[PDB]
Amino acid sequence: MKYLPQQDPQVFAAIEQERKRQHAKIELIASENFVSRAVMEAQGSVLTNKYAEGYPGRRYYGGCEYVDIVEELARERAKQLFGAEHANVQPHSGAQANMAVYFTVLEHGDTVLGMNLSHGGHLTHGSPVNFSGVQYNFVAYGVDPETHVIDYDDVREKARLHRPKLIVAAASAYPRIIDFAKFREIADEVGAYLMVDMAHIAGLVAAGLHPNPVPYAHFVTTTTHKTLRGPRGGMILCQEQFAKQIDKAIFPGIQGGPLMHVIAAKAVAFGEALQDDFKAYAKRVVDNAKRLASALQNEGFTLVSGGTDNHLLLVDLRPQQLTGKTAEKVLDEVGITVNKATIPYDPESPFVTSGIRIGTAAVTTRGFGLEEMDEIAAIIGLVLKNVGSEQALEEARQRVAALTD
Amino acid sequence: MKYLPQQDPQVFAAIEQERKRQHAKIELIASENFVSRAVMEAQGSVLTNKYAEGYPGRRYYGGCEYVDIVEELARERAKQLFGAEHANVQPHSGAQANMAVYFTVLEHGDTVLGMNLSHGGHLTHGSPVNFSGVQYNFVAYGVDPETHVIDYDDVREKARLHRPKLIVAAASAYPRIIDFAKFREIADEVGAYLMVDMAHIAGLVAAGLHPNPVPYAHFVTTTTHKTLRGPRGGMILCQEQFAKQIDKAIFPGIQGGPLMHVIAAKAVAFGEALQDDFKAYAKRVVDNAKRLASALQNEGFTLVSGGTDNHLLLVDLRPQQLTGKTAEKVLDEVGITVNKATIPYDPESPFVTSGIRIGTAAVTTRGFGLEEMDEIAAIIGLVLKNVGSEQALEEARQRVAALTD
Ligand SMILES: *Cc1c(COP(=O)(O)O)cnc(C)c1O
Numbered sequence: 001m002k003y004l005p006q007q008d009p010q011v012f013a014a015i016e017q018e019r020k021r022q023h024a025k026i027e028l029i030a031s032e033n034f035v036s037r038a039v040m041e042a043q044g045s046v047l048t049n050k051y052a053e054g055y056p057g058r059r060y061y062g063g064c065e066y067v068d069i070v071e072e073l074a075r076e077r078a079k080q081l082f083g084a085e086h087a088n089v090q091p092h093s094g095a096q097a098n099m100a101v102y103f104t105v106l107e108h109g110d111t112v113l114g115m116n117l118s119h120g121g122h123l124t125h126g127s128p129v130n131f132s133g134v135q136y137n138f139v140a141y142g143v144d145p146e147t148h149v150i151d152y153d154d155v156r157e158k159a160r161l162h163r164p165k166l167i168v169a170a171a172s173a174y175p176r177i178i179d180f181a182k183f184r185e186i187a188d189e190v191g192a193y194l195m196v197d198m199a200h201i202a203g204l205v206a207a208g209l210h211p212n213p214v215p216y217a218h219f220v221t222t223t224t225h226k227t228l229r230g231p232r233g234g235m236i237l238c239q240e241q242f243a244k245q246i247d248k249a250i251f252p253g254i255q256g257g258p259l260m261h262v263i264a265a266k267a268v269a270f271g272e273a274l275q276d277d278f279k280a281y282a283k284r285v286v287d288n289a290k291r292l293a294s295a296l297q298n299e300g301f302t303l304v305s306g307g308t309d310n311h312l313l314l315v316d317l318r319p320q321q322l323t324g325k326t327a328e329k330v331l332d333e334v335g336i337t338v339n340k341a342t343i344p345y346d347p348e349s350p351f352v353t354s355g356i357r358i359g360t361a362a363v364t365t366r367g368f369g370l371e372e373m374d375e376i377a378a379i380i381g382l383v384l385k386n387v388g389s390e391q392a393l394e395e396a397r398q399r400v401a402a403l404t405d
Numbered sequence: 406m407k408y409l410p411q412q413d414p415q416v417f418a419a420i421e422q423e424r425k426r427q428h429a430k431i432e433l434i435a436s437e438n439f440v441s442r443a444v445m446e447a448q449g450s451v452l453t454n455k456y457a458e459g460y461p462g463r464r465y466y467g468g469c470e471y472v473d474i475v476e477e478l479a480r481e482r483a484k485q486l487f488g489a490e491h492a493n494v495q496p497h498s499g500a501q502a503n504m505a506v507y508f509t510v511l512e513h514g515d516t517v518l519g520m521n522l523s524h525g526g527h528l529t530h531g532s533p534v535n536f537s538g539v540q541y542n543f544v545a546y547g548v549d550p551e552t553h554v555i556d557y558d559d560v561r562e563k564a565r566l567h568r569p570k571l572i573v574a575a576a577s578a579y580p581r582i583i584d585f586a587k588f589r590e591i592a593d594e595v596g597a598y599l600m601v602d603m604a605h606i607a608g609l610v611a612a613g614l615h616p617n618p619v620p621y622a623h624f625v626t627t628t629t630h631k632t633l634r635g636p637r638g639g640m641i642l643c644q645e646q647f648a649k650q651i652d653k654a655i656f657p658g659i660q661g662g663p664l665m666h667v668i669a670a671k672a673v674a675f676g677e678a679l680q681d682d683f684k685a686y687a688k689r690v691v692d693n694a695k696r697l698a699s700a701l702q703n704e705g706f707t708l709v710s711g712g713t714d715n716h717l718l719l720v721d722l723r724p725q726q727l728t729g730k731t732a733e734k735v736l737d738e739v740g741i742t743v744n745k746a747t748i749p750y751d752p753e754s755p756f757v758t759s760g761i762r763i764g765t766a767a768v769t770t771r772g773f774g775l776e777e778m779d780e781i782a783a784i785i786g787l788v789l790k791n792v793g794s795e796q797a798l799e800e801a802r803q804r805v806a807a808l809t810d
């Protein structure tokens with residue numbers, strides 16, 4: 001940076017702390033990643049200066065010729081990446097992407113069926129303190145108590161009983177492949193729309209390492225950040241028959257001016273995802289997650305669903321008589337970043353939990369491989385088996401430092 | 406830029422076109438401005454990589470120590486700037502700021518009283534194609550047919566008849582000072598909350614050049630961009646008694662993860678606004694607007710309300726037998742950027758209009774002064790009085806080029 005250090009010493013010092021923190025820590029939060037310098041440059045551009053309400057070639061303001069090119073690059077690259085008939089790259093966030101789809105097909109009080117929030121469902125899939133649960137009548141399907149895999153007969157029964165207008169598939173803490181074909185079959189049986197929120201798995205979908213929801217879902221929502229490794233924001237994909245309605249839902253429906261600089265950064269990220277090396281990256285993500293899962297089991301940890309098909313895993317800490325909160329806290333002391341997470345049928349509250357959620361997207365971006373997964377698992381074992389030993393925690397600290405260099 | 410040109414030639418070429426366009430054109434769109442290099446660097450930072458759901462010291466994820474510093478800098482500087490008891494700097498946009506306030510105090514179907522959308526009210530103040538008009542029962546107050554000033558007796562009568570739970574004051578196309586004291590008096594009479602949407606005038610409020618709504622309003626919403634000259638985004642200010650509710654409305658209410666890099670940029674912008682030179686800038690904005698108004702009247706143009714108290718003016722083009730659409734189009738041909746705008750009691754549709762809206766914030770940022778205002782008015786006169794003369798339009802083109810260098 002050139003201008004920030006001089007103009008705003010306080011803000012610059014804090015940013016610099018954050019940058020150094022990002023390098024020093026082992027980031028295992030499943031939603032996290034590190035974007036490229038090109039992505040950052042794009043959202044640090046003069047495009048922040050442009051109002052462009054509306055859509056390419058259909059704007060409310062003049063002078064949008066070039067931001068139109070940018071937005072269209074984003075839309076076309078997204079369509080290439082996911083094989084979607086239509087993309088809306090304007091959503092400010094994953095929350096707003098979901099908000100727009102809900103606004104499109106639902107009326108206030110309509111019934112929606114989503115994944116149980118304690119089993120992997122997201123806040124925006126019907127939490128009673130979120131607009132979703134306040135504005136619509138959410139009901140939930142569960143995972144099997146033993147296998148922790150989505151019970152598709154439960155999805156079906158809930159759908160048939162409650163007759164939702166919309167079924168939501170996808171998750172923020174589900175370690176297995178989701179069967180979108182079965183979701184669509186159930187949706188068809190009850191005459192419901194199917195929305196798939198692929199935020200966590202979008203990068204894996206782009207790389208052909210998770211089945212693509214696009215052919216089965218009426219609407220697909222996503223973050224551009226997370227496994228897709230883009231700037232912070234949202235996106236909607238849908239069939240052409242819903243394009244006009246979805247676009248109107250975003251604007252003038254729920255948003256005003258789009259963030260054109262962030263949209264530029266989205267275009268850049270999609271460009272990167274279209275490359276062969278992103279496919280290799282995403283495979284390493286999944287490979288690393290399997291390896292980490294295996295290595296954790298070697299240390300004596302129990303994993304929700306007994307492993308992972310994707311980028312993330314959940315450790316059930318009940319065998320170690322630890323809460324997720326305790327684990328999160330002590331790992332923070334040694335420089336490993338995880339979050340507490342409810343495990344299916346968790347006896348603890350969501351604010352304490354019996355689990356931790358772990359993902360490999362971030363460490364994989366940093367160049368970590370299988371050997372590093374083994375060592376991360378070993379450090380986690382050392383820490384969680386010796387929570388009262390400052391000697392053990394100091395060793396862990398040093399081993400974490402060795403990994404981050 | 407260093408990395409974008411190599412990584413993404415297509416995106417870079419479009420960005421470069423946009424940058425050159427921003428320099429070449431005379432930007433008179435009232436909502437537009439040009440942010441500092443420091444602001445851009447801040448939102449081009451690694452802070453995009455951090456999930457920080459929740460609030461400073463009360464986050465859902467670990468590792469937020471430094472982004473907490475950044476957010477708190479934003480909140481404290483905002484409180485200094487506007488004398489507010491509480492700030493929420495997380496809203497993704499002005500639309501989301503408004504959305505959160507609505508979510509806080511209203512139930513589905515509640516009555517809200519806002520400014521007539523054809524008289525200066527914003528889309529998010531009850532448009533039937535916007536969430537505001539769909540989710541709540543909006544009624545409108547008007548300006549006087551002759552003076553084009555808000556009719557406060559009409560505000561009062563509408564309030565007493567319709568008994569709104571919420572009254573909204575503020576505008577996207579109102580050229581006069583708004584009397585927030587009178588709005589609060591009316592709100593008090595009918596037991597309604599008062600929300601002031603100061604998006605357009607926020608920079609002027611910060612510089613003491615427009616009365617501050619904070620002491621009179623329960624809630625103040627704003628964009629961080631526009632006259633405040635910050636990054637693209639939103640903010641809510643409120644009394645401490647609503648702080649918890651407002652914070653919960655933003656998260657977990659209507660948004661997910663905040664844009665920490667944009668919040669950094671907000672902090673930077675507020676820092677800039679706190680400086681003496683921003684006060685001088687804002688005075689030049691208002692001075693330039695008066696001068697431009699005066700100069701346009703000298704050319705024979707009629708202005709809505711007969712002039713301006715702020716950064717913006719509206720030309721009533723009926724005396725010249727032109728639509729706003731025609732004016733917008735021809736000015737685009739010579740390198741002057743305006744937008745068509747409905748004038749109070751406009752006989753045309755909102756898609757054709759009898760007016761153009763013009764603001765001076767952008768040209769003032771570029772260093773334009775009184776002499777430049779005179780010349781801009783003269784060029785506008787030349788163009789709109791000679792719409793069929795390519796000779797006149799070419800002269801205008803050359804005069805515009807002379808101004809932008
Ligand atoms: C992260 C996530 C979201 C929310 O995205 P934000 O950008 O934080 O609003 C929504 N749905 C799912 C499944 C997510 O993982």
Ligand SMILES: *Cc1c(COP(=O)(O)O)cnc(C)c1O
Nearest residue numbers: 256257498499500527576577604
């Ligand atoms: C510009 C504006 C908005 C909307 O802000 P976005 O950032 O475009 O969502 C809302 N209210 C008023 C008065 C505005 O001027």
